[PDB]
Amino acid sequence: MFEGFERRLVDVGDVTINCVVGGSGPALLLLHGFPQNLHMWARVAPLLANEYTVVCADLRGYGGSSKPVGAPDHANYSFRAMASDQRELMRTLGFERFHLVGHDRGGRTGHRMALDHPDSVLSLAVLDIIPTYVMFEEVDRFVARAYWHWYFLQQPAPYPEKVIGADPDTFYEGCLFGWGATGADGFDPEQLEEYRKQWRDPAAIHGSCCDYRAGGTIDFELDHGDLGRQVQCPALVFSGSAGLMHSLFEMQVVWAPRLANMRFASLPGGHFFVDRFPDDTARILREFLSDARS
Amino acid sequence: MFEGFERRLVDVGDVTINCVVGGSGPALLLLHGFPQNLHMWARVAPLLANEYTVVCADLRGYGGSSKPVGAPDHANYSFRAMASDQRELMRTLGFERFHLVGHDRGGRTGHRMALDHPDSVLSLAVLDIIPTYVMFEEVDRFVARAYWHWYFLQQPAPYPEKVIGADPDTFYEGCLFGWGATGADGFDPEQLEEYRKQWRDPAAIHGSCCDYRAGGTIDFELDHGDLGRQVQCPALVFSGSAGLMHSLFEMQVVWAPRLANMRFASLPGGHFFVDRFPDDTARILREFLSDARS
Ligand SMILES: [Mg+2]
Numbered sequence: 160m161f162e163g164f165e166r167r168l169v170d171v172g173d174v175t176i177n178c179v180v181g182g183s184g185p186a187l188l189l190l191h192g193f194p195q196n197l198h199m200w201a202r203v204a205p206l207l208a209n210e211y212t213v214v215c216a217d218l219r220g221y222g223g224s225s226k227p228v229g230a231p232d233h234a235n236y237s238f239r240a241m242a243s244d245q246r247e248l249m250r251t252l253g254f255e256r257f258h259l260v261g262h263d264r265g266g267r268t269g270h271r272m273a274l275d276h277p278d279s280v281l282s283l284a285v286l287d288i289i290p291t292y293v294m295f296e297e298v299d300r301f302v303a304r305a306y307w308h309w310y311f312l313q314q315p316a317p318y319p320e321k322v323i324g325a326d327p328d329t330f331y332e333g334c335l336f337g338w339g340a341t342g343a344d345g346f347d348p349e350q351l352e353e354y355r356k357q358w359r360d361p362a363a364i365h366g367s368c369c370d371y372r373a374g375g376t377i378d379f380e381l382d383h384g385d386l387g388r389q390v391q392c393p394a395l396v397f398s399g400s401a402g403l404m405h406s407l408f409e410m411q412v413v414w415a416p417r418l419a420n421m422r423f424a425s426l427p428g429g430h431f432f433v434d435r436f437p438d439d440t441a442r443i444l445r446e447f448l449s450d451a452r453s
Numbered sequence: 454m455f456e457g458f459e460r461r462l463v464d465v466g467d468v469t470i471n472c473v474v475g476g477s478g479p480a481l482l483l484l485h486g487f488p489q490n491l492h493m494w495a496r497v498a499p500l501l502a503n504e505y506t507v508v509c510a511d512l513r514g515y516g517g518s519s520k521p522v523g524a525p526d527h528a529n530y531s532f533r534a535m536a537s538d539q540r541e542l543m544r545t546l547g548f549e550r551f552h553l554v555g556h557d558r559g560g561r562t563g564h565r566m567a568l569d570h571p572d573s574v575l576s577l578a579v580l581d582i583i584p585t586y587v588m589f590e591e592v593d594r595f596v597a598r599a600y601w602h603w604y605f606l607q608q609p610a611p612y613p614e615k616v617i618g619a620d621p622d623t624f625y626e627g628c629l630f631g632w633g634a635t636g637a638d639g640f641d642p643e644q645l646e647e648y649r650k651q652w653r654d655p656a657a658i659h660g661s662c663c664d665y666r667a668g669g670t671i672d673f674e675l676d677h678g679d680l681g682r683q684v685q686c687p688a689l690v691f692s693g694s695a696g697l698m699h700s701l702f703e704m705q706v707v708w709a710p711r712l713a714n715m716r717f718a719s720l721p722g723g724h725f726f727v728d729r730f731p732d733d734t735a736r737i738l739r740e741f742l743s744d745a746r747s
Pocket residue numbers: 236237238241369370371373374378
């Protein structure tokens with residue numbers, strides 16, 4: 160995978176970020192989510208590398224990046240800290256400004272990065288997510304059941320860590336395959352093994368739990384404080400139209416207040432649509448990036 | 454434990470209910486909750502047996518009672534089904550009417566039994582619970598985090614079953630001890646070993662998960678249909694004042710619309726106060742039962 164891309168472990172502040180870099184053209188940072196890592200972009204990145212310098216990076220707590228022990232207030236795993244790492248990675252790789260695409264946690268990191276450092280983000284695509292603030296503030300019995308892990312993973316360490324660690328493949332496969340009878344079909348075998356191998360690392364089990372602890376505390380408070388602001392660069396809300404999120408919330412409604420320049424796109428898949436629709440994901444991203452740059 | 458009590462496995466229809474019976478005087482049925490069984494009453498029952506014929510029974514899906522495979526609609530684990538079993542158990546043991554005390558799932562079973570067969574329940578004590586309907590209709594980010602298991606346990610079989618199955622002791626200890634520093638202290642070793650035998654039983658892991666799946670579906674719907682109806686017999690709302698519940702809800706507010714004759718009592722413990730305050734629990738239940746009968 161990532162034939163021809165340079166593989167780099169870059170020290171940024173107090174953590175090291177694992178990434179692959181390939182291509183030429185404007186920089187494009189692709190950030191993964193849970194329970195995955197930069198390998199979710201194994202097919203999409205090579206397709207866009209004919210026009211962009213594509214960087215796929217692992218968020219702190221995931222894949223090959225540092226996984227520090229979470230602080231009692233979880234602040235070292237807020238999206239502000241996660242975004243800072245990635246923005247500094249890009250600056251180190253020589254890119255002061257860059258386009259950003261983020262799925263799941265990576266989209267949340269991107270949203271926070273655009274609010275914290277508007278000048279660094281040329282465009283923002285958030286894949287299959289609604290704002291973290293809305294997820295919690297408007298939770299109801301249906302949202303809490305669908306997103307049960309948003310609450311289980313917030314339990315104090317080391318409880319989720321020990322429960323997950325007793326059989327991580329079973330635990331994460333549930334988060335990845337979800338409950339449809341299609342469920343595991345469609346994942347590329349090679350990318351799926353990268354999710355498996357990397358998630359069995361107890362330090363990554365811990366780091367991802369800390370990301371979720373922060374989400375419901377520090378991130379929620381930071382997001383609350385920024386409700387009077389909008390992301391100003393061109394933005395794309397890109398959803399899996401056959402997924403649970405597209406079904407419980409209206410994209411326009413939850414995002415319009417956060418994005419000053421918003422476009423929409425969807426593919427007929429679920430939350431992990433990038434895994435099943437690599438080529439079409441690359442196509443939609445390329446069209447949006449072209450629109451953004453115009 | 455339960456010295457002098459008779460052990461009975463009683464067929465009530467399509468399930469068999471495990472119970473112990475002791476004492477003399479009016480019938481008193483004590484129903485346990487999650488993640489426990491009739492042994493949570495090992496100290497309280499002998500104290501009350503000097504004035505009541507005390508029956509401590511295992512709910513279907515728990516302890517030594519039948520644990521059928523959950524139906525796709527979870528109806529065989531509704532509180533209506535669980536209540537029917539216990540009312541028939543009492544009738545078979547010779548009692549058409551009895552006092553009822555329930556903690557956690559057992560209190561939910563009791564509320565539903567009083568709504569479905571008011572003439573069979575002479576008095577109803579609900580221990581450390583607020584109504585199922587409220588738990589779900591008024592959920593917010595704090596409630597969902599505190600009662601995360603109400604959402605994890607609703608995930609489709611066999612997922613929670615396999616996650617829990619990999620390390621039952623770690624999973625249920627977190628449910629029983631909680632996150633506080635004095636979490637594990639103060640549980641009687643003998644009673645704890647009986648809860649543990651259940652924790653490790655795959656059929657009980659499944660049964661309890663199905664109880665939670667029904668609670669969020671069939672039970673919520675049945676309860677919705679009965680809003681406005683109040684149980685008429687004397688009732689006691691008995692809570693652990695040092696616990697989470699007492700902290701997020703007001704007992705008066707959530708129970709008043711459900712109980713026409715309501716009294717209150719509390720002990721300075723958490724959700725599992727019965728384990729820590731057997732003598733005082735019996736004292737309070739004795740005082741309430743006397744008041745009820747008078
Ligand atoms: Mg976070």
